[PDB]
Amino acid sequence: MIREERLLKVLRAPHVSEKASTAMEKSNTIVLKVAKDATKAEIKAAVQKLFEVEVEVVNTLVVKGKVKRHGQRIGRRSDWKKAYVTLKEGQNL
Amino acid sequence: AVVKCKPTSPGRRHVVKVVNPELHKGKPFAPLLEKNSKSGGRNNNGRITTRHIGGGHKQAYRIVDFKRNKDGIPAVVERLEYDPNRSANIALVLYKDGERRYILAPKGLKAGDQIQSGVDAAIKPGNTLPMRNIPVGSTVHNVEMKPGKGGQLARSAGTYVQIVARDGAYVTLRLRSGEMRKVEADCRATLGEVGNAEHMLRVLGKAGAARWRGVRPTVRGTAMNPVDHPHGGGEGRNFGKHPVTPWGVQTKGKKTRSNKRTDKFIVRRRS
Amino acid sequence: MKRTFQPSVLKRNRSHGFRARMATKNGRQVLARRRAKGRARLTVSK
RNA sequence: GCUCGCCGGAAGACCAAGGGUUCCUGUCCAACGUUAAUCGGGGCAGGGUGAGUCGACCCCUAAGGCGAGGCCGAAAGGCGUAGUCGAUGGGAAACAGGUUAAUAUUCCUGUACUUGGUGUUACUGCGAAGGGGGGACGGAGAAGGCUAUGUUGGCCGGGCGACGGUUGUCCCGGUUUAAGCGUGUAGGCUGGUUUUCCAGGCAAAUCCGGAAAAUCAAGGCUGAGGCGUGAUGACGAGGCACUACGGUGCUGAAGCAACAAAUGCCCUGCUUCCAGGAAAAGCCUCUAAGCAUCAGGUAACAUCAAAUCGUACCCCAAACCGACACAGGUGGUCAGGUAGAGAAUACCAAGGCGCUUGAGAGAACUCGGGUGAAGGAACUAGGCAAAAUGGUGCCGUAACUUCGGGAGAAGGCACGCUGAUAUGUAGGUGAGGUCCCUCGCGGAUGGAGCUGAAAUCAGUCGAAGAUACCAGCUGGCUGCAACUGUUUAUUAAAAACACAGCACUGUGCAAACACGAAAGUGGACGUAUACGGUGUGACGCCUGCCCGGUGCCGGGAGGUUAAUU
RNA sequence: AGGACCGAACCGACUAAUGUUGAAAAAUUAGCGGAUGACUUGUGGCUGGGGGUGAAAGGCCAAUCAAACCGGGAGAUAGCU
């Protein structure tokens, strides 16, 4: 499922928002931006090795980037992948 | 039996239908079924090549044994069936070795009757054998034109052929068209007439009845415009043409047979 | 009333898509003329 | 915020297609919004779409597409075999509750299920691209059993009324609970088991098919719903606490029965008819090549896995197709109360709205309506338009007729409410009890309770009882076309086209004919009771004379006559 | 049983008024015909321009079809304005 070079490139950033904070307080679930091509398996092992915590389940979605017009021309933001990584009951960080 | 319908509605008054209680009710023998793809009269270019074909009921194809070359093994007729693909009826026959086939149902044949094919089968209705061993004068149907190729002559409901002569390797047949034709005597034929002679006594009674059979309307040429048909348009009802096909060829009277390679088998043309 | 454009992405792509142009010599010429004109959109794609 | 009004088989809710952030929150108002705009589907920023079992992908094919070689064609290319693609169809599995400003059968809580891998253990013949089964199939109709759902009663909580009465035969509200698991019911289909033999199933078969004995009468298969369990729970009016007054927390009564009842389910059924009603895989079974103490098969427990993409929002529309925030167009699903035959119609519930210029005024004239003295088609090309008729039951109904029709012909009578028959009837449903039982979701008996049209008699209110909405005008003579259909999308729906029926004529199958320089294909997996072309146009009585002209069919002697020599 | 009868949905389009710089480049309102059939409709497919398709009106083939649309021959030609 893993090879360390790949594992280091899969997790991109913490995602901060009220939904992401509540998901931590209420469900011990951390919300992340991950590599667009990442799989739930890679995310689960990357989190388990790097952040050194035990993972229960990983859920993922793909966010469509918003379009912004500019007179006669449009710009488009990038799609990215969101990961809801649920930690095991014994919460850490 | 042919039955008239009562005029409880105007499209019923003239219906006269062929109802045969000998025919199996319900479903056929599935292992002899194939798919049957309707065409709308269009060829592999997607063009209408034969007009007036379209719609009408879906149909499954019954695999019918026109060759009748399971020689030596007797068979019994299990039942007569309705076949949507043809005017004749068919018989489901069971061979002594467990095999089942369909055959054209000859007149008089019914469940229980025994059939058989081969050089030595008995001279009786529903039997098949090479015409060099059917007595001159007999009445046959499902006649082969080449040995072992499969029956092609006199299959439609009520038709039959008469062997009027045998000489050399060739028999002479009076086809149902009236034509006298030579066919080689090793060709197979089945004794009797094709069943369901009352087929020609049906009266569809209404337009929808022809639609159920996949026949679309015919539009008369003289009802068109000149650009569409040589029978032109006019101004009120006008004609004054010599009647032709939509493609300018003389209908009514012009011979269109042109086959020098088979001329030699035609003893006398139909009259 | 009912108008002439009734959309269907599946039918759009089959009649006019990139692969449909590529399938015939003349469709491949539609794409040549279009690349020589310098178009941004060769066909309507995803 | 309190009222009023509108839709309610939609103007509500949910899908697909299509769109693509329009979704939620904050903030802003120039432009966009047919007005103002603090508001917005507008600007700016941030947030938001969570799946083994919902869809896609995936396996399987349909029409059809593509197509190694190949056949054909000046080139380009056309067609096509093996194959390979292609859903609008077939194929494993998840439900109820809670939660967010915005997602949820995806998160959480509870309770499940499916198919694979790995291990353990007991038993065991395993094995396919092949065989067989199965999957797997129409229309119409009948009506029995049910559920969804509703109504009443009971039960529980609350109520005692702004103005005469209201502790009662009173008022209001609630009375909800899934998949899964167990049971195998109303009902549907079918005889079962053993042995032996065999020209079929491309070889093989223990399977299918066929044959022959033996033997038992009950065996198997399918199957809504109910009941139980799931549920020690969830949901639940309300209560008590807090509250930034938006909310949050804790707690929580009854949760039954009877009757009615679908167009949903049993039903891919049953009955019946002719027009005779996909394919392939998954699946079950059979063997072949093989493998034989291996492998593999079946089972229980355990363990692991089920990736990836979609998921926001609009969706009969202000977000899709219409240049517009356009009276247009857009496939499927859901179906509450009263009246009603009803999915018509009227009023309502849930839910959603008052349609993005308003304020006054109360002229002509225009638009859309209501009423009208006397007359009643005198109008006009024409009763154009209006007005009128309109329901159910019973009585009754002409010429003509192809005996079906004409016919709802025409015309007439009854119609509300209350009581009696009967404090609720005929009927429908059906409990306790008693008895039997191959004991059950059983049978008989029994008739309580519940529900309930219609009739007659008597009485009674109004001008009027099919009172509203809703809802045929009728008759006589005649042209034309038999009829139902079809047609000039957008000035013509007709007497025009079609039609069943009739005739002529071609066509012996490598058919005629048609699309194609061709290959190939349609005709047709049809075969003269068939297929094409042409005309006529149900049916009834019938269809006469003319072959000179033009056309077509047949003819061979003579004349004339091409390339060629 | 029925191209059977009455009648919503659904399909159609006989009459009239309105509208005609429309709410709408064909509609709206009141009426109207079919409504188990030659019915109606979703998804996808096939047929291509002297060609298709046509229950036939020269109808339809992407808002003007007795020969579509686009590009090219092209500055066709115009004894005409």
CATH number for the segment(s) B195-271: 4.10.950.10
Collapsing DSSP states into helix, strand and coil, what is residue A92?
A: coil
From residues 140-199 of B, list those within 7 angstroms of strand D by Cβ. 145, 152-159, 175-177, 179, 181, 196-199
- Cα A48 from Cα A11, distance rounded (Å): 11
Chains that touch A (3 or more CB pairs under 8 A): none
* Cβ neighbours for B144, distance < 8 A, ≥ 6 positions apart: B150, B151, B152, B153, B183, B187, B188, B189
Domain of C44 in residue numbering reads as: 1-46
CA B260 to C1' D558, in angstroms, rounded, equals 30
CATH number for the segment(s) B1-113: 2.40.50.140
Report the DSSP pairing between strands A73-76 and A29-34: unpaired
Task: Give the residue range(s) of CATH 2.40.50.140 domains in chain B.
Answer: 1-113
CA C8 to C1' E27, in angstroms, rounded, equals 27
CA C37 to C1' D216, in angstroms, rounded, equals 90
- Cα B132 from Cα B189, distance rounded (Å): 10
User: Which whole-number Å values give the CA distances from B91 to B64, B83, B84, B99, B155, in the listed order?
Assistant: 9, 10, 14, 14, 14
User: Which whole-number Å values give the CA distances from B175 to A3, B171, B268, in the listed order?
Assistant: 85, 12, 11
- Cα B207 from Cα B84, distance rounded (Å): 19
Q: Which helix (H) or strand (E) segment is A4 a member of?
A: helix A4-10
Closest CA to C44 of C10, C5, C4: C10
Nucleotide nearest to B212 (CA to C1'): D275
- The DSSP letter of residue B150 is -
- Cα B203 from Cα B18, distance rounded (Å): 9
- CB B136, CB B164: distance < 8 Å: yes
Total number of domains in chain C? 1
CA B208 to C1' D342, in angstroms, rounded, equals 31
SS in 3 state form for B30-59?
A: HHHEECCCCCCCECCCCCECCCCECCCCCC
Total number of domains in chain A? 1
First to last CA, chain A: 23
Q: Is the CB of C10 less than 7 A from some atom of nucleic acid strand E?
A: yes
User: Residue B7: beta bridge partners?
Assistant: none
Q: Is the CB of B49 less than 7 A from some atom of nucleic acid strand D?
A: yes
First to last CA, chain C: 30
CATH code (residue A45): 3.30.70.330
Cα-Cα-Cα-Cα torsion A26, A27, A29, A31, nearest 10 degrees, comes to -50
- CB B104, CB B88: distance < 8 Å: yes
User: Which whole-number Å values give the CA distances from B253 to B208, B244, B256, B268, in the listed order?
Assistant: 32, 10, 9, 18
Domain of A75 in residue numbering reads as: 2-93
- CB B197, CB B157: distance < 8 Å: yes
From residues 79-108 of B, list those within 7 angstroms of strand D by Cβ. 81-88, 94-100
Cα-flanking dihedrals φ and ψ of residue B174, to 5°? -90, 100
DSSP letters for chain C: ---S----HHHHHHHHSHHHHHHSHHHHHHHHHHHHHT-S-SS---
* Cβ neighbours for C39, distance < 8 A, ≥ 6 positions apart: none
